[PDB]
Amino acid sequence: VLVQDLLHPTAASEARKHKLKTLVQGPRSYFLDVKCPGCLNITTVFSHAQTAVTCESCSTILCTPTGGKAKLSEGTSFRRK
Amino acid sequence: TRSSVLADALNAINNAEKTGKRQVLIRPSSKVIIKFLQVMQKHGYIGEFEYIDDHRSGKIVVQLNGRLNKCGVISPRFNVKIGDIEKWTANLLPARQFGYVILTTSAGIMDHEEARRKHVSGKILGFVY
Amino acid sequence: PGKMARTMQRSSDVNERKLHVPMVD
Amino acid sequence: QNDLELQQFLRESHLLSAFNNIVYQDDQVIGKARSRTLEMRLNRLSRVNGHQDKINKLEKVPMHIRRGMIDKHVKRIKKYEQEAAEGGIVLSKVKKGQFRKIESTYKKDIERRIGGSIKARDKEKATKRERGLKISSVGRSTRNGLIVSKRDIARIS
Amino acid sequence: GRMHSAGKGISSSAIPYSRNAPAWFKLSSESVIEQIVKYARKGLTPSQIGVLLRDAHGVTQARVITGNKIMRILKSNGLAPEIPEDLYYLIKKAVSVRKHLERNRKDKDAKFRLILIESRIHRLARYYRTVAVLPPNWKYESATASALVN
RNA sequence: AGCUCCAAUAGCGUAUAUUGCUCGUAGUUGAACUAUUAAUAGGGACGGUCGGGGGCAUCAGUAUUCAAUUGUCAGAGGUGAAAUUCUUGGAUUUAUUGAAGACUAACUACUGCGAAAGCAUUUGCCAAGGACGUUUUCAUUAAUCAAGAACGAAAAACUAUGCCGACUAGGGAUCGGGUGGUGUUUUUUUAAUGACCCAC
Ligand SMILES: [Zn+2]
């Protein structure tokens, strides 16, 4: 904002700037490998997930979408990517 | 809204230059704009430009020094023959040898001097000075 | 335009010239 | 607003307050109040038909003391404006040039030795900013770029 | 632009650079074809189908996990649409607002917004008639709406 | 000397005349590219929201007016002072209820919402709308609008005025949402994971 190149912008600025005004527009959400102890089961989860995803074997609620990023239900072990 | 992409790009570059910046974001790109920047580069009216790719419609970055006095685009892309190139150059450009006018002929996008050199004519895009 | 104006000038002139004084005969 | 006594009383309404703290008529007025009233009356009555320099020639004062005075006065006006807008009051809306007009300036009589506004900046904003010379001797400029008429093409081609 | 309005508030999801599958993904083309067609037999909307894929089924995008897009998959399997889902949804909202007008007649709010939605529908139906996947005499009415959503 | 001087001299002067608001139809403008993209073009869905936005009843605040009940009996009103009027069948006033018809103050503004006029108690019912966020959907479906249509309580006004823009940078404030950190404030096997700090 002081002054910068437009060619190869600094990585801190690429992260801090809006994700649509950067050089190549792209996402910021990711996925989560989450394990539920009801059957010791691992599921693939979107970070801005739009419906209440349930496990395949046992009927346990995983998360409810609260605005941008979701809040996982209490008692589930998550991991990024 | 969308007036024409050539008008949008050239208004952007002339605006930021007459203010006095040095790097301009022109988005989106087109091949006519690419050759426009190429001929402006080969006459040395800007510095160096670059096409940044994002696979929808790419961005254009330019480094320009100071020389763009005024350059634009004509809206009715009519016909010209070579005596009309003479009359149009004198009545459009500042003075006699000054600036260039850019032509779309059967040999594509180039100015009137290389056009008269290669003995062609065609439709007219705009002007640089 | 100019032809109409010049013929108007001549015609109004000579009409003013052909109108004259009353007389008893 | 066609009346004569009414509007004179109306614009003297702050002067009589300032030199009072009602004798508002023209006989029970006495002294400094009367002097300032007479000055303001002849001021307007000459301003309506005079040359503005010899109407209001501003009285001489060396440069640093006059600039210090105008600085202090604009500072007081700004603090007054801030206290009003913070504890919301209404106030007379004035043009962008002049300052406010307070009981401070009416009693202390600062208009004569500072003035309405910076006259140099007044003429500066009143003059027209210089554009470029017209090169484009053919068409009409627009956001879309040049537009050249078919009348022009039939003229030239 | 914000057509038929005044804002400038951008609501757009960006698009990645890469157009392939990610690494930790282990599901196959025909398997997601199975899941999409079973969802089509269930009866939801293909947009929401792709949503529940990227939430649940890990499908980052259906076209890139299988080179045919979602509508290509539905037209291939024979689940082709009768009128596109956008115009279907606009018709449903329009007939709902007309029901509200019938129950509460004196609502000029609903009147003006009904005029604007029918303007939008006139434009979009003009486009779908010009490309003519739609029968080129499709003339909307309230009874047509109540029959297509009921 | 036949007063003086100057200009054309084979030409020459005179006069007239001249050099409200929003939809939308014609027209006008209108993406990159050699079962393509999905434009910081447009529509759409979904998730959480937002709003003194809208229609329908509903519950309530006081105040005013009238009616009735009791109280002590000598003026009440309004105006600069007056007057009209009410006031021994008890005026005004104090207490009690009752009823009708309008309005929802202090909180109220550096604002929110609506296209404009307009928009302020409660809880439901119905139906719209903006913005946020999404590796969601289509595939350019956009735009400027003349004619036509919809919406607009309808004594009103009376010192107010700042160049203009196809507009470059900015700063402190707000309002609405998201992203992250951080501690408070919170609380804890049970109920809505809310408020505040700051960076984005
Ligand atoms: Zn399980």
UniProtKB/Swiss-Prot annotation, chain A:
Gene Ontology biological-process entries: maturation of SSU-rRNA from tricistronic rRNA transcript (SSU-rRNA, 5.8S rRNA, LSU-rRNA); ribosomal small subunit assembly; translation
Modified residues (S-methylcysteine): C39
Pfam families: Ribosomal_S27e
Gene Ontology MF annotations: RNA binding; structural constituent of ribosome; zinc ion binding
Cofactor requirement: Zn(2+)
PTM per Swiss-Prot/TrEMBL: The N-terminus is not modified.
Cofactor note: Binds 1 zinc ion per subunit.
Zinc finger residue ranges, C4-type: 36-58
Subunit structure: Component of the small ribosomal subunit (SSU). Mature yeast ribosomes consist of a small (40S) and a large (60S) subunit. The 40S small subunit contains 1 molecule of ribosomal RNA (18S rRNA) and 33 different proteins (encoded by 57 genes). The large 60S subunit contains 3 rRNA molecules (25S, 5.8S and 5S rRNA) and 46 different proteins (encoded by 81 genes).
Family: Belongs to the eukaryotic ribosomal protein eS27 family.
Stated name of the protein: Small ribosomal subunit protein eS27A
UniProtKB/Swiss-Prot annotation, chain B:
Main location: cytoplasm
Misc. remarks from the entry: Present with 40400 molecules/cell in log phase SD medium.
Protein name: Small ribosomal subunit protein uS8A
Localization of this protein: Cytoplasm
Subunit field text: Component of the small ribosomal subunit (SSU). Mature yeast ribosomes consist of a small (40S) and a large (60S) subunit. The 40S small subunit contains 1 molecule of ribosomal RNA (18S rRNA) and 33 different proteins (encoded by 57 genes). The large 60S subunit contains 3 rRNA molecules (25S, 5.8S and 5S rRNA) and 46 different proteins (encoded by 81 genes).
InterPro entries, alphabetized: Ribosomal_uS8, Ribosomal_uS8_CS, Ribosomal_uS8_sf
Pfam families for this protein: Ribosomal_S8
Annotated GO MF terms: structural constituent of ribosome
GO biological process: cytoplasmic translation
Cited NCBIfam families: PRK04034.1
Function: Component of the ribosome, a large ribonucleoprotein complex responsible for the synthesis of proteins in the cell. The small ribosomal subunit (SSU) binds messenger RNAs (mRNAs) and translates the encoded message by selecting cognate aminoacyl-transfer RNA (tRNA) molecules. The large subunit (LSU) contains the ribosomal catalytic site termed the peptidyl transferase center (PTC), which catalyzes the formation of peptide bonds, thereby polymerizing the amino acids delivered by tRNAs into a polypeptide chain.
Coiled coil (residue ranges): none
SUPFAM superfamilies documented for this protein: Ribosomal protein S8
Keyword Ribosomal protein part of the UniProt annotation: yes
The family this protein is said to belong to: Belongs to the universal ribosomal protein uS8 family.
Record keywords, A-Z: Cytoplasm, Ribonucleoprotein, Ribosomal protein
Keyword Transcription: no
UniProtKB/Swiss-Prot annotation, chain C:
Organism: Saccharomyces cerevisiae (strain ATCC 204508 / S288c) (Baker's yeast)
Segments traversing the membrane: none
Function: GTPase required for synthesis of 40S ribosomal subunits and for processing the 35S pre-rRNA at sites A0, A1, and A2. Controls access of pre-ribosomal RNA intermediates to RCL1 during ribosome biogenesis by binding of RCL1 in a GTP-dependent manner and, via its affinity to U3 snoRNA, delivering it to pre-ribosomes. GTP-binding and/or GTP hydrolysis may induce conformational rearrangements within the BMS1-RCL1 complex allowing the interaction of RCL1 with its RNA substrate. Required for RCL1 import into the nucleus.
Location(s), subcellular: Cytoplasm; Nucleus, Nucleolus
Self-association and partners: Interacts directly with RCL1 and the U3 snoRNA to form a stable subcomplex. Component of the 90S small subunit processome also known as 90S pre-ribosome that consists of the 35S pre-rRNA, early-associating ribosomal proteins most of which are part of the small ribosomal subunit, the U3 snoRNA and associated proteins.
Protein name in the entry: Ribosome biogenesis protein BMS1
Family: Belongs to the TRAFAC class translation factor GTPase superfamily. Bms1-like GTPase family. BMS1 subfamily.
UniProtKB/Swiss-Prot annotation, chain D:
Source superkingdom: Eukaryota
Localization per Swiss-Prot or TrEMBL: Nucleus, Nucleolus
Subunit structure: Interacts with KRR1.
Biological role: Required for pre-rRNA processing and 40S ribosomal subunit assembly. Seems to act in the processing of 35S rRNA at the A(0), A(1), and A(2) cleavage sites.
Protein name, UniProt field: Protein FAF1
Organism from which the protein derives: Saccharomyces cerevisiae (strain ATCC 204508 / S288c) (Baker's yeast)
